[PDB]
Each structure stands twice: as C-alpha cells, then as structure tokens.
C-alpha cells in the first residue's frame, strides 16, 4: 500500500529495468502506464499485471508523448510520478568511430525524450505534488571507455535533474535520478553477444562490482518506489544502484 | 513486514534522528535495541514501543559497546543492522577558537564510536548477511562555516563507509551512509537557542533548502529502512537527505 | 616559456573568458589561433598580440571547424592544445518556457561544437602528445535555477571529458575540463542588463562566492595554462574556478 | 619568479612528495622551510638547495610546531604558504586487524598535525594574504581496500579543507587540497617491499591509472605551485593528481 491510489508512467517499461520498475510500482499499490516503442514486452506485461496498462509511445516523438500524457489523465484521472527510463547504450565505439549524427540521435532518446515527457507531465505533477525519477547512469559521473556519446547523454540527465529540482521545489514537485551500474537486462545481453567472447565479457561485467554480481531490474525498481513514496525530503539527488563499482580503483614514467 | 524477524541496533536512539530511525525500524517489523548515553528519552521509548528495548551505552567507551553487542545477541539471538547515529555538532566555533583537545573529543564520538561498534558487530553481521548504516552529514561533503572539527569528523565517516564497504563486500555485508542536512531535532533547537535571535536562525535554517523546510527524523528513518531492507545492490553509497540544500549556490576584484 | 613552441586553438577567443585564455597562452610562449564566430573582438586581439592570429569559425558548422584545423596545421605545422571555450548561457528561463528546439540549439553550441573540434583535432594532438581543455560550468555539477538546458549541456561536457580521457589515455592525450563559476565577462554583463535591477543582480552574483567577488578571465586562463603545460599526471579532471561558490549552503513541514 | 619573495613551509619535506614540493617552490623563487621528523633527507636537501632550510619538527608535537612557525618568522620575516604534506599510509590491514589505538595515532599525524600547523600559521597567513595547501588522497573520496583508518583520515582532511576555506575566505586566505593517487615515492617502495611479489604489486599500481604509470613528486609539486601562485579564485578545491585512476570501473545473483 506504500503508493496506493497513485498513477505512475514508466517509459521503456516493456523489458529490462523499466519492466522491473513497473512491477515494483504495481506491487506498491499504484496503477502504472507502461510506455514503450515496442509492443511485444509491454503488451504481455499489461496482460500479466492487473493495475498496469500499455500505451505505445516513442519518447522521441513529441506527439506520441502528448498522447501518452493525455491518455493517462483521461484513463486514470491523475498523474503522480514519471519514471524516465527509456534509453539506449550503443555498442562500444572508439571516439573517432562516433559521429555527430549518431550523437544527436542518442541525445534525442536519452536526454530530450526525458525532457519532453517531464515538461508535458509537470502541470499534472504540480496538481498531485508528484515527482520525477530519471534513470541516468553511473558512467555519467565517472566516465566509461568507448562510449563518448552515451556518457555525455547521461551526464546531461543527472545535471538536468538537479536544475529541474531547483525550479520545481517551490511547487512541491521533487525531481531525482537513479544512476544504475551494471544491471543484467536484455540490453546487457545484446551488447555482450556482439563481443568475441560473450561469456568472458559477462564475467568481467560481474566482477566490476565489489559485490561480485550485476544488479537486477527489481533492485532499481525498489529504489524508484523509495524515491516516489518515502523520500519526501529528497530532491535533486543521484541514487547510486551500482554494487560499489565506483569504489576504489620506470614506475613513474 | 519489510524487515520482519531482523534485529537492529540504533546508537543515539533516545531522541532526534535516532528516535525516528528506531520508530521506522519498529514499524517495519524489526526488533530494535536503543543505545544511548542518556536514559531519559530511550527508557520512555522502550515503554512506548513494543519491539524496542533500551540499553545504556556510551559509544566512546569500548567496554560499554562490548556489552551492548553481547547483550543484543544474548537477548535476541542475531544482529542484522547497526545504525551509527550517535554524534554531536558543537556550537559554532571560529577556527582559532577550536582546540586539538576538543577536536579529539569530537572524533571520539562522531568517528571512533562508529568505528568501535561496527568492528564489534561485524562478526555477527557476517553471519546474518546484515548491513551497516552510518549517519554522516551533508557538510562533510560541502563544508560548513564555524565547524572545522565537526566537518572533519563527518568527512571521515563518509570516507570510512566507502573503505569498509570495499572490505566487507566479499563477505556479503553492505556498508552505507546517510548524509542529512538540516533536520529539526533537539540538537537543532538547542543550537538555535544559543544564538542572539533564535527564531531568525531557525527561519534561515528552513530557507537553506529549496524545499523551504527542515527535514524530519522520520524521513531519515525511512531512508535507513530502505538501505537495510531493499537496497541489496547498494554498498558504499552516501544517501543525501537534505531537501536540496547542496543544489545551486569592481565586480571581479 | 612554460608553453614555448606550442600551438593552441581557443574557441570563442574573441572576448570574455576565451580572450583571457588566449592572453594567458601567448604570455606562456605559445602561438594561439583565436577562433570566433564574431570578427570584432578576435580581429582586434590578433592586432594586439604578436603570436595570436584570428580565424573566423562557427563551431556549430562542421566545415568551418574542418577549415579551422587545416588552416592551423598549414600555418603553424602542429597542434598541441584545443581549448573548447565557445558557449552560451541563455537568459533565465523557467522550465515551461524552454523548448526542445532551443535545447537542441544550445546542445549544438555548448556540447557538439566541443565534440566536433575535438574529433577533428585529435589526430594532430596524438602526434604532439597534446591535450584537450573543455570549459564546462560549476552548475553542471550542482544545478542552477532557470537554466535547465544550459545545466544539461554542461553536465554533458564534464561527463564527455571523462569518457574521452579514458579513450585517449593509451595514446598519451590528456583531456581535462575547467568548471568556472561566476566570471565577470560580457556575457555576465549582458545577462545582468536584462534584469529589472542590474546593479542588484551583479551584487548578488559577487556575494555568491565566499571570496566576495566574481572571477576574472585571466584566472581561468592561468588554470588552462596549468592544465596544458604542467599537469602531466592529470587527465579527466574537473578543475573548479569558482571562488568557493559550491561550498556550504512548523520548521519541518 | 612565479612565487618570488614568498616563504613556504612544507611538512614532511625530506623525501617523497614533500621533497618534490620543496623543489618546485624553490624553482619558483620562494624560500622554503623543510619540516620533517627525520633529519637525513631534509638536511641533505638544505645543503643541495639554496633557498631551502631544514627545521626538525614532528607535526604531532604541538611545541615542535610552535617552534617551527616562530623560527620561520624569525628567520624569514613572513609566511605565505603552508603545505601540509606529512602523512603516512600503514601496511594493508583488514578491518578486524585495525585498532582504535592505531586509528588514533594515524589521526594524530594525517589530520591533527595538519590542523595544528594550520592554526598556528593562520595569523601570519592573514597578514600576507597567503594560502594553505593540504595533501589529502584520492581514496578519501573513493575508498580503498584494507585501509579503513587511512581512508578516514584523508576524508577528514578533504572535508576540513572546505570548512576552513569558508571560515578564512573573509580574511583573504585560500585553503585548498591536492588529492594524489599512486605517486612513486619511498613510502610506495616500502609498502611494495612488504608484499609477497613486490614487482607484481608495483606493476599493478602502475596499471591502476589510465595513463599506465604512477605519478611523480614533481607533478604534485607543480600542482602545489599553481595553487599557491596562480589560483587566486580557487578556494576549497580538491585538485586530483591521480592519472585518471578514479575514471571508469547467474549474472545478477
Ligand atoms: N542495463 C544497464 O546496465 C544499465 C546501466 C546504467 C543505466 N542503464 C539505463 O537504464 C535504462 C534502461 O536500460 P535497460 O538495460 O533496461 O535497457 P533495455 O534495452 O533492456 O530496455 C529499454 C526499453 O526501452 C524501450 N525504448 C527504447 N527506445 C525507446 C523510445 N524511443 N521510446 C520508448 N521506449 C523506448 C525499449 O523498447 C526497451 O523496452 C536506460 O536509460 C539505460 O541507459 C542501464
Ligand atoms: N540535526 C541535524 O540537522 C543533523 C544534520 C546532519 C547530521 N546530523 C547527525 O545526525 C545524528 C543525530 O543528530 P540529532 O540532531 O538527532 O542529535 P541529538 O542531539 O538530538 O540526538 C543525539 C542522540 O545521541 C545521543 N548520544 C550522544 N552522545 C552519545 C554517546 N557518546 N553514546 C551514545 N549516545 C550518545 C544523545 O544522548 C541523543 O539522544 C548525529 O550524528 C548528527 O551529527 C544531524
Ligand atoms: N561567465 C561566466 O560566469 C561563466 C560561468 C561558467 C561557465 N562559463 C563558460 O565559459 C565560456 C565562455 O563564457 P563567457 O562568459 O566568456 O562568454 P562570452 O559570451 O563573453 O564570450 C563567448 C565567446 O564565444 C563566441 N562564440 C559564441 N558562439 C560561438 C560559435 N558558435 N562559434 C565560435 N565562437 C562562438 C562569442 O562570439 C564570444 O566571443 C562558455 O562556455 C560559458 O558557458 C562562463
Ligand atoms: N605516495 C602516494 O602514492 C600517495 C598517495 C596519496 C597521498 N599521499 C600522501 O602524500 C603525502 C606524502 O606521501 P609520500 O608518499 O611522499 O610519503 P613518504 O613516507 O615517502 O614521505 C613522508 C615524509 O613525511 C615525514 N613525516 C612523517 N611523519 C612526520 C611527522 N610526524 N612530522 C613530520 N614529518 C613527518 C617522513 O619522515 C617523510 O620524509 C602523505 O600525506 C601521503 O598520505 C601519498
Ligand atoms: C560490452 C558492454 C560494454 C559496455 C556496457 N555498458 C553497459 C551500461 O549501460 C553501463 C555499465 C556500467 C555502468 F556503470 C553504467 O553507468 C552503464 C551495459 C552493458 C555493456 C556491455
Ligand atoms: C546555529 C546552528 C549552526 C549550525 C547547525 N548545524 C546543524 C547541522 O548539524 C547540519 C546542518 C546542515 C547540514 F547540511 C549538515 O550536514 C549538518 C544543525 C544545527 C545548526 C545550528
Ligand atoms: C542574471 C544571470 C543569471 C545566471 C547567470 N549565470 C551565469 C553563468 O554562466 C554561471 C554562473 C555561476 C556558475 F556557477 C556557473 O556554472 C555558470 C552568468 C551570468 C548569469 C546572470
Ligand atoms: C601495497 C600498497 C597498498 C596500498 C598503497 N596505497 C598507497 C597510497 O597512499 C594511495 C594509492 C592510491 C590512491 F588513490 C591514494 O589516494 C593513495 C601507496 C602505496 C600502496 C601500496
Ligand atoms: O536478459 C537478461 C535479464 O533481463 C532482465 O530484464 C530479466 O528480468 C531477466 O529474466 C533476464 O535474465
Ligand atoms: O525538538 C525539535 C523536534 O525534535 C524531533 O526529534 C521531535 O520528533 C519533534 O517533536 C521536535 O519538535
Ligand atoms: O564586460 C565585463 C568584463 O569582461 C571581461 O572579459 C573584460 O576583460 C573586462 O574588461 C570587462 O570588464
Ligand atoms: O623511492 C621511489 C622514488 O621516490 C621519489 O621520491 C624519488 O624522487 C625517486 O628518485 C625514487 O625513485
Ligand atoms: Na493489466
Ligand atoms: Na518496548
Ligand atoms: Na597577432
Ligand atoms: Na639551503
């Protein structure tokens, strides 16, 4: 009952972290709108979860997002929390192999899609004293190899979260982000499968954490439910869900 | 039921943030040992809360802490979480008014008391796959005026949390900290009362947060229950409970 | 002589921080290419400074940047340091007053212009074991009110700096950023002039720093010369030039 | 001539990083007082460097530090910069192998010695508009394995630097810290020699940095001269000299 009576939109909710966040909110008593550009996972999740419904929406398309918000309000009468989870990590790319074109496309998804939904949702979040949760990335803070565009987009999300928290504080709307590290999801599996030795890549990904494993969508979901339902004095925070990966680390020429 | 069957020790649990943490854990289903050097608040809290008991213990006294741990195990049979909350903020002091003697005394409480209980508790936390929660301070990260010793002690706590998280990760024990900002507690009230215009000082303390108020012990308590019970992929994190105080901020000579 | 024989490109070098960086590098013995989209300041600076030349270049235009690099190499035979300083802060804008269109345009300048020049320069920086210096912003790290797009762009720059530092480390190219706070420049003067009480706004800007004044272009310039010429074990750092602005900060409802 | 006419005290200046800092300041034109508890290195350094003199002083002994300051003023007539470099890293120690006694002793050196000299020097630094430079450690920020006391002491130093910067800003005294990573010094060599395979330990220490080597005392020294002589808008900063070590990092159970 921690979030009973509330209405939550989760973008990219059809699989991976997003689906874990959907499940955590349904388990907390909320009604959840699953937004995804892909019908397969999200439609099945609606059938599985009473309290969740699926709305096809590509967050890079402004009119899709307008309809997502208007349909959420039409169907459920309020909006309490937006979780901006839709995002992508390209395959590893050396800096000279990236392009401004690809960088712009990744900004459209990872940054501007979050911006667009948040902007359209904020009038309703102000009415409900609701909150925004952005899914950023640990590597926005610490960097990652072979990922210049991705890292830039996530540094932008974390910073934007802090700016918006300042602007929306007088109106009672909290704005926070979660920065996951290595979470075992279909994206992780897909990227590993591109590598010469996928099993070795996966093993390395597990050992990057002091805890010796990758994280689960459910663990990101629990962090999101905490931020929405019990973190009433938290705004503009970056909540790390990383298993400790950021901890620790002639001869001098 | 989020933490049912678990046993938690909260130091400085007789009033303020510590009492809020005690209440949050009792509400989650845990049994709680209230440690305090002062009988008044903690004894009343035991009477009030089924599931909480009071043990007199000054965390700066090694034998008191040894007895705290042995009595917790004798009475409850396990130990799952230690919350190192006991600590103090001296009245505002200019650097030249501080002393090495006073600095050492504050280190004994704010830093070494946390170290001592954690060390004595860790064998039991390893058996239960339990966790440590240290109550640090936002100003350990960002500084504060007229508080050189206090700030130093809290920078030490936050750093120590990260080091211990690394060391205890192979054993399945997570170690995290909460960094509160301005929380309305008897300590805050006592410090304000020393100032020339206490009401003005309190007003200034409220407006230091974008949220326009100070935080509550209950909000720190909810963050602690989250870290203990649902943050299984979080270790070595600093969870800010500050209301956004860290956000934002000839002419050039 | 600290940077004698070296060749430096400074974008946005015609006024403000960029001109201060140009002067600092000329004073260190380097030859400097002043890039700017505006001829007025940069052309005068060339006439004033032996060792500096002006090249008209809008960093948002890929062909302009290609020509900037090819002309630098044609005229000077090497390239040792790129300082990505061109950038803009829009007038204060509430989140609901911003647009995706304006956000994209600001990303083109503050983020993608930095990306584009860095990419085109890197083959030459690898040959010289040179370095990249990005001018980010303190508010990328801590947030700012009425500046969601700006803050996002600068969070991206700081993060991108760390990612590129990782990628270019095997090749001996260091990549660092400077995050200024309030620096008294024509941009600051222009933004203040839009406000109802410009003098009051300027006074507030000075008092945001514990040092009680704004910074100077020359101080950012000295930090840049340090990073280029003497910081050989620094890569991926964020060097704050802020005057301490990030330091420090019923009642509980 | 960057720091000509100025007087600098470097603690632990007889070898390692401290000796590198001494050399960098002498090369900048300053007169330097080498403080050390060990005569061997510091006495030889005085003989070698015109402009440097050696004063025997154990920074944990208050009367030694009082004499250090009074002798500096008696001999040189002013004091412009204090570099608190004396410190120690114990051999790797598991948390259960540490003691409160050893922790207190390490606090006396790494934290309280810095506090004591700074306090005694500040009246003179206010007269000269001088500055304080504390040598902290990257692992104060990110943690390290088998080093709970050390990490705590360095977290305290970094935090204390920020608090004192706030307090001394109205008086025109800047207070900054440098956080080195792996620097090749006699301490590093001594710790490696205790390990089963010292050469393997050294190799691992080099590869912890993206730059693929450890740092040099001279590089820390250049950062110190920058902070003293050219960073006039920097106070309360943590300048990382780490080679990038902090950058970057069933399957989910
Ligand atoms: N998996 C990790 O290790 C990891 C680490 C750090 C951060 N993250 C972040 O977590 C989020 C989720 O990652 P994941 O691993 O679950 O990814 P995933 O690819 O498994 O799932 C992403 C989901 O988002 C949907 N989506 C993609 N583009 C969309 C669009 N334009 N509109 C709507 N939906 C869209 C996909 O169809 C998919 O269902 C992303 O923001 C990612 O950057 C993931
Ligand atoms: N109140 C704030 O704004 C604030 C802000 C940041 C951090 N904190 C931290 O939160 C913690 C609690 O602060 P608070 O405001 O509730 O303080 P408080 O003074 O109201 O309560 C502290 C409690 O700890 C007990 N205690 C003190 N010394 C002890 C000792 N040696 N052994 C055992 N118990 C001892 C006291 O008797 C008291 O019951 C402290 O670590 C403090 O530094 C508080
Ligand atoms: N002034 C501050 O307080 C402050 C604070 C933090 C960061 N910064 C950053 O410092 C940098 C310089 O700021 P400033 O205050 O000196 O600004 P400014 O407006 O005074 O100077 C910027 C210069 O860049 C040039 N420029 C703008 N767009 C360009 C383009 N497309 N191509 C090439 N040149 C272009 C302008 O013509 C101008 O000469 C910017 O990145 C800014 O975001 C400034
Ligand atoms: N070497 C590294 O990798 C490294 C990394 C991070 C931080 N640091 C810090 O840099 C500083 C210097 O380290 P180093 O590697 O050069 O060490 P080092 O042991 O080589 O040199 C330390 C010097 O300080 C002196 N000293 C020790 N105790 C003293 C006391 N009580 N009073 C006066 N002088 C005293 C020693 O005699 C010696 O000359 C320390 O604060 C250390 O924690 C070093
Ligand atoms: C082969 C490969 C490369 C890079 C990958 N990166 C991620 C990722 O998104 C991520 C990971 C850790 C972080 F700390 C983080 O912030 C993000 C996932 C799978 C990968 C697979
Ligand atoms: C007159 C006064 C002065 C300083 C005080 N400081 C605190 C405190 O402990 C605290 C506050 C904010 C933080 F961000 C923080 O980390 C700690 C409480 C009451 C005070 C009253
Ligand atoms: C009226 C106004 C509003 C906002 C302004 N902001 C800046 C700026 O660029 C900046 C400032 C501080 C920082 F810490 C920072 O990172 C950036 C300059 C002038 C302004 C004038
Ligand atoms: C065998 C061993 C173990 C640990 C050591 N640690 C240091 C050290 O002081 C240090 C290193 C990196 C940092 F990032 C840092 O902050 C400090 C030096 C030698 C060592 C040798
Ligand atoms: O594909 C990797 C993992 O992705 C997660 O989102 C699913 O919940 C797991 O069942 C699956 O093993
Ligand atoms: O004394 C200030 C506040 O302290 C808190 O710990 C109590 O829960 C409040 O009831 C009280 O108003
Ligand atoms: O316009 C504000 C300031 O801008 C700086 O870039 C110039 O160097 C100053 O002379 C001027 O006062
Ligand atoms: O002992 C390791 C290193 O220590 C440094 O302080 C010295 O300057 C080097 O010559 C020496 O190789
Ligand atoms: Na359903
Ligand atoms: Na009871
Ligand atoms: Na010229
Ligand atoms: Na000499």
Short mmCIF file of C-alpha atoms in Angstrom, two decimals, chain C:
data_model
loop_
_atom_site.label_atom_id
_atom_site.label_comp_id
_atom_site.label_asym_id
_atom_site.label_seq_id
_atom_site.Cartn_x
_atom_site.Cartn_y
_atom_site.Cartn_z
CA UNK C 1 58.50 29.93 -21.70
CA UNK C 2 56.20 27.43 -19.94
CA UNK C 3 54.49 26.54 -23.24
CA UNK C 4 57.05 27.79 -25.75
CA UNK C 5 56.95 26.28 -29.22
CA UNK C 6 53.40 25.01 -28.77
CA UNK C 7 50.30 25.80 -30.83
CA UNK C 8 46.91 26.33 -29.15
CA UNK C 9 43.41 26.80 -30.59
CA UNK C 10 40.94 28.69 -28.38
CA UNK C 11 37.32 28.71 -29.47
CA UNK C 12 35.22 31.72 -28.58
CA UNK C 13 38.52 33.51 -28.06
CA UNK C 14 37.39 36.99 -29.12
CA UNK C 15 36.13 38.23 -25.73
CA UNK C 16 35.43 37.14 -22.18
CA UNK C 17 36.99 34.00 -20.76
CA UNK C 18 38.25 32.94 -24.17
CA UNK C 19 40.22 36.15 -24.65
CA UNK C 20 41.70 35.69 -21.17
CA UNK C 21 42.77 32.17 -22.13
CA UNK C 22 44.31 33.47 -25.37
CA UNK C 23 46.30 36.07 -23.44
CA UNK C 24 47.50 33.54 -20.87
CA UNK C 25 48.77 31.18 -23.57
CA UNK C 26 50.52 33.97 -25.50
CA UNK C 27 52.15 35.04 -22.23
CA UNK C 28 53.36 31.45 -21.77
CA UNK C 29 55.17 31.49 -25.14
CA UNK C 30 52.63 29.67 -27.28
CA UNK C 31 51.23 30.63 -30.65
CA UNK C 32 47.46 30.89 -30.46
CA UNK C 33 44.68 30.61 -33.02
CA UNK C 34 41.68 32.66 -31.91
CA UNK C 35 38.50 31.04 -33.23
CA UNK C 36 35.29 33.04 -33.03
CA UNK C 37 32.06 33.48 -34.96
CA UNK C 38 32.34 37.26 -34.37
CA UNK C 39 35.13 39.16 -36.07
CA UNK C 40 35.17 42.28 -33.90
CA UNK C 41 36.93 41.16 -30.73
CA UNK C 42 39.10 38.47 -32.26
CA UNK C 43 40.48 40.63 -35.07
CA UNK C 44 41.47 43.33 -32.60
CA UNK C 45 43.09 40.71 -30.37
CA UNK C 46 45.23 39.47 -33.27
CA UNK C 47 46.44 43.01 -33.92
CA UNK C 48 47.23 43.47 -30.26
CA UNK C 49 49.02 40.17 -29.60
CA UNK C 50 52.06 39.05 -31.56
CA UNK C 51 51.77 35.31 -31.57
CA UNK C 52 47.97 35.22 -31.90
CA UNK C 53 46.02 35.06 -35.17
CA UNK C 54 42.27 35.15 -35.79
CA UNK C 55 40.31 32.60 -37.81
CA UNK C 56 36.58 33.13 -38.33
CA UNK C 57 34.85 29.89 -37.40
CA UNK C 58 31.41 29.00 -36.06
CA UNK C 59 31.95 25.78 -34.10
CA UNK C 60 28.41 24.58 -34.90
CA UNK C 61 29.33 24.40 -38.60
CA UNK C 62 31.36 21.29 -39.34
CA UNK C 63 33.03 22.70 -42.45
CA UNK C 64 34.11 25.82 -40.52
CA UNK C 65 35.80 23.59 -37.96
CA UNK C 66 37.45 21.44 -40.62
CA UNK C 67 38.94 24.60 -42.10
CA UNK C 68 39.98 25.86 -38.65
CA UNK C 69 42.04 22.73 -38.09
CA UNK C 70 43.51 22.53 -41.59
CA UNK C 71 44.47 26.22 -41.51
CA UNK C 72 46.08 25.86 -38.07
CA UNK C 73 48.22 22.99 -39.35
CA UNK C 74 49.01 24.74 -42.64
CA UNK C 75 50.10 27.93 -40.90
CA UNK C 76 51.84 26.58 -37.79
CA UNK C 77 52.82 22.98 -38.54
CA UNK C 78 51.48 21.34 -35.36
CA UNK C 79 48.67 21.46 -32.82
CA UNK C 80 49.26 20.94 -29.09
CA UNK C 81 46.15 22.09 -27.25
CA UNK C 82 42.50 22.72 -28.02
CA UNK C 83 40.52 24.87 -25.58
CA UNK C 84 36.79 24.42 -26.19
CA UNK C 85 35.52 27.64 -24.67
CA UNK C 86 32.80 28.78 -27.10
CA UNK C 87 29.46 28.52 -25.36
CA UNK C 88 26.45 30.48 -24.24
CA UNK C 89 24.13 30.89 -21.27
CA UNK C 90 20.58 31.92 -22.32
CA UNK C 91 18.63 34.43 -20.27
CA UNK C 92 16.93 32.89 -17.23
CA UNK C 93 14.08 30.65 -18.41
CA UNK C 94 11.54 28.74 -16.38
CA UNK C 95 11.29 25.08 -17.43
CA UNK C 96 7.87 25.54 -19.02
CA UNK C 97 9.27 28.46 -21.09
CA UNK C 98 12.04 26.35 -22.62
CA UNK C 99 11.60 24.39 -25.84
CA UNK C 100 13.14 21.25 -27.29
CA UNK C 101 14.12 23.44 -30.24
CA UNK C 102 16.05 25.88 -28.06
CA UNK C 103 17.56 23.00 -26.11
CA UNK C 104 18.80 21.39 -29.35
CA UNK C 105 20.34 24.68 -30.47
CA UNK C 106 22.17 25.09 -27.16
CA UNK C 107 23.41 21.49 -27.36
CA UNK C 108 24.80 22.27 -30.83
CA UNK C 109 26.97 25.04 -29.43
CA UNK C 110 27.88 24.05 -25.88
CA UNK C 111 28.27 20.29 -26.46
CA UNK C 112 28.50 19.30 -30.13
CA UNK C 113 30.83 22.15 -31.13
CA UNK C 114 33.25 20.91 -28.47
CA UNK C 115 32.82 17.35 -29.72
CA UNK C 116 33.41 18.32 -33.36
CA UNK C 117 36.60 20.33 -32.89
CA UNK C 118 37.99 17.73 -30.50
CA UNK C 119 37.36 14.93 -33.02
CA UNK C 120 38.99 16.82 -35.90
CA UNK C 121 41.95 17.87 -33.75
CA UNK C 122 42.70 14.53 -32.09
CA UNK C 123 44.86 13.03 -34.90
CA UNK C 124 47.16 16.04 -34.56
CA UNK C 125 47.07 16.02 -30.75
CA UNK C 126 48.13 12.37 -30.81
CA UNK C 127 51.17 13.31 -32.92
CA UNK C 128 52.19 16.04 -30.46
CA UNK C 129 51.11 14.28 -27.25
CA UNK C 130 48.89 17.32 -26.80
CA UNK C 131 45.81 17.86 -24.68
CA UNK C 132 42.18 18.99 -24.69
CA UNK C 133 40.73 21.53 -22.25
CA UNK C 134 36.95 21.91 -22.17
CA UNK C 135 35.33 24.91 -20.47
CA UNK C 136 32.33 23.46 -18.65
CA UNK C 137 30.48 25.12 -15.71
CA UNK C 138 30.12 24.63 -11.98
CA UNK C 139 26.35 24.40 -12.41
CA UNK C 140 26.75 21.25 -14.48
CA UNK C 141 27.71 19.65 -11.15
CA UNK C 142 25.39 21.43 -8.71
CA UNK C 143 22.46 22.77 -10.78
CA UNK C 144 21.20 26.31 -11.30
CA UNK C 145 17.74 27.86 -11.26
CA UNK C 146 16.02 28.85 -14.51
CA UNK C 147 18.61 27.11 -16.67
CA UNK C 148 17.53 23.53 -17.43
CA UNK C 149 19.01 23.41 -20.97
CA UNK C 150 22.24 25.17 -20.02
CA UNK C 151 22.85 22.96 -17.00
CA UNK C 152 22.20 19.83 -19.06
CA UNK C 153 24.70 20.90 -21.73
CA UNK C 154 27.43 21.48 -19.14
CA UNK C 155 26.76 18.23 -17.30
CA UNK C 156 27.28 16.61 -20.71
CA UNK C 157 30.59 18.42 -21.29
CA UNK C 158 32.03 17.40 -17.93
CA UNK C 159 30.98 13.77 -18.40
CA UNK C 160 32.24 13.68 -22.00
CA UNK C 161 35.61 14.97 -20.79
CA UNK C 162 35.94 11.91 -18.52
CA UNK C 163 34.91 9.43 -21.23
CA UNK C 164 37.33 10.90 -23.76
CA UNK C 165 40.12 10.98 -21.18
CA UNK C 166 39.69 7.22 -20.81
CA UNK C 167 39.71 6.63 -24.55
CA UNK C 168 42.71 8.85 -25.32
CA UNK C 169 44.89 7.85 -22.36
CA UNK C 170 46.60 4.96 -24.26
CA UNK C 171 47.61 7.49 -26.89
CA UNK C 172 49.13 9.99 -24.45
CA UNK C 173 46.50 12.71 -24.95
CA UNK C 174 45.11 14.20 -21.74
CA UNK C 175 41.56 15.55 -21.65
CA UNK C 176 40.50 17.85 -18.81
CA UNK C 177 37.88 20.46 -18.06
CA UNK C 178 37.65 23.72 -16.14
CA UNK C 179 34.35 24.49 -14.44
CA UNK C 180 34.13 28.24 -13.84
CA UNK C 181 31.61 29.82 -11.53
CA UNK C 182 30.65 33.48 -11.80
CA UNK C 183 33.27 35.12 -14.05
CA UNK C 184 32.86 38.80 -14.94
CA UNK C 185 32.59 38.78 -18.75
CA UNK C 186 30.48 40.48 -21.42
CA UNK C 187 28.01 37.59 -21.19
CA UNK C 188 27.56 38.26 -17.47
CA UNK C 189 27.14 41.98 -18.16
CA UNK C 190 24.59 41.31 -20.93
CA UNK C 191 22.50 38.97 -18.78
CA UNK C 192 22.53 41.39 -15.84
CA UNK C 193 21.38 44.20 -18.13
CA UNK C 194 18.18 42.26 -18.90
CA UNK C 195 17.16 42.17 -15.26
CA UNK C 196 14.95 44.74 -13.51
CA UNK C 197 17.81 45.93 -11.25
CA UNK C 198 21.10 45.07 -12.99
CA UNK C 199 23.27 46.51 -10.21
CA UNK C 200 21.44 44.42 -7.61
CA UNK C 201 21.85 41.30 -9.77
CA UNK C 202 25.59 41.97 -10.11
CA UNK C 203 25.96 42.49 -6.35
CA UNK C 204 24.16 39.19 -5.72
CA UNK C 205 26.49 37.49 -8.21
CA UNK C 206 29.53 38.77 -6.33
CA UNK C 207 28.24 37.65 -2.95
CA UNK C 208 27.52 34.12 -4.18
CA UNK C 209 31.26 33.42 -3.66
CA UNK C 210 32.88 33.19 -0.22
CA UNK C 211 35.65 35.29 -1.80
CA UNK C 212 33.10 38.10 -2.26
CA UNK C 213 33.87 38.85 -5.91
CA UNK C 214 33.45 37.28 -9.31
CA UNK C 215 36.36 35.68 -11.09
CA UNK C 216 38.41 37.06 -13.96
CA UNK C 217 39.11 35.66 -17.45
CA UNK C 218 42.80 35.79 -16.52
CA UNK C 219 42.21 33.37 -13.65
CA UNK C 220 40.53 30.86 -15.96
CA UNK C 221 43.42 31.40 -18.35
CA UNK C 222 46.01 30.57 -15.70
CA UNK C 223 44.14 27.36 -14.89
CA UNK C 224 44.17 26.45 -18.60
CA UNK C 225 47.92 27.07 -18.94
CA UNK C 226 48.48 24.89 -15.86
CA UNK C 227 46.43 22.05 -17.35
CA UNK C 228 48.22 22.28 -20.70
CA UNK C 229 51.78 22.78 -19.55
CA UNK C 230 52.31 21.36 -16.04
CA UNK C 231 49.54 18.87 -15.24
CA UNK C 232 51.10 15.84 -16.91
CA UNK C 233 49.52 13.34 -14.48
CA UNK C 234 46.06 14.95 -14.69
CA UNK C 235 43.50 13.55 -17.10
CA UNK C 236 39.74 13.56 -16.80
CA UNK C 237 39.74 16.15 -14.01
CA UNK C 238 37.26 18.95 -13.41
CA UNK C 239 39.21 21.97 -12.16
CA UNK C 240 36.87 24.33 -10.29
CA UNK C 241 37.46 28.07 -10.73
CA UNK C 242 34.51 29.28 -8.70
CA UNK C 243 35.64 31.32 -5.69
CA UNK C 244 34.14 28.71 -3.37
CA UNK C 245 30.53 29.11 -4.57
CA UNK C 246 29.92 25.36 -4.20
CA UNK C 247 30.98 25.37 -0.54
CA UNK C 248 28.42 25.38 2.23
CA UNK C 249 24.77 26.23 1.76
CA UNK C 250 6.41 24.34 11.79
CA UNK C 251 10.12 24.17 10.94
CA UNK C 252 9.99 20.67 9.42
CA UNK C 253 6.81 20.84 7.34
#
